[PDB]
Design a protein around this ligand. Structure first.
Ligand code: NA
Ligand code: NA
Length: 158
């Protein structure tokens, strides 16, 4: 009833490779809020702006007990390099096989170049402490976005 998206049960048990070398799963985040933001490519202008915006708000997300995860299909090494250069203090998921992306339906198609072209669409989601996807943002406008996500989280957490 409060969910805006339904994920396959197996999604919650997928091993998610993180920057820094560990793995997590969505089920492992039970009991707290989780922000999951998908972005198309490490170390590009919009993706860097977005990451830095979430990073600046980390104390506010902490106040609410929430954790953040950024997601792209870049490698663990790429993610480590991106985190170190930018000073990110939250983890990035290396979704190399796009399993997490597909679960959240963020791989979108565009008819371009006389081809059917698939790519990550910038998207963010709020996962409740009980594992429900309760809010979504798709075709994300980076400017103002992290602020909007924080505000929505606060409104939901009540
Ligand atoms: Na970088
Ligand atoms: Na959660």
């Amino acid at each position: 009833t409060d969910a805006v998206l339904e994920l396959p049960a197996a999604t919650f048990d997928l091993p998610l490779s993180l920057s820094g070398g560990t793995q997590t799963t969505l089920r492992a985040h039970a009991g707290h809020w989780l922000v999951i933001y998908f972005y198309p490519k490490d170390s590009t202008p919009g993706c860097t702006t977005e990451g830095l915006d979430f990073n600046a708000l980390l104390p506010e997300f902490d106040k609410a007990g929430a954790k953040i995860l950024g997601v792209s299909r870049d490698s663990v090494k790429s993610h480590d390099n991106f985190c170190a250069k930018q000073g990110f203090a939250f983890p990035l998921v290396s979704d190399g096989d796009e399993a997490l992306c597909r679960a959240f339906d963020v791989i979108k198609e565009k008819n371009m170049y006389g081809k059917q072209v698939l790519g990550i669409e910038r998207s963010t989601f709020l996962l409740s402490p009980e594992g429900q996807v309760v809010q979504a943002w798709r075709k994300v406008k980076v400017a103002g976005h992290a602020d909007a996500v924080l505000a929505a989280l606060k409104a939901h957490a009540k």
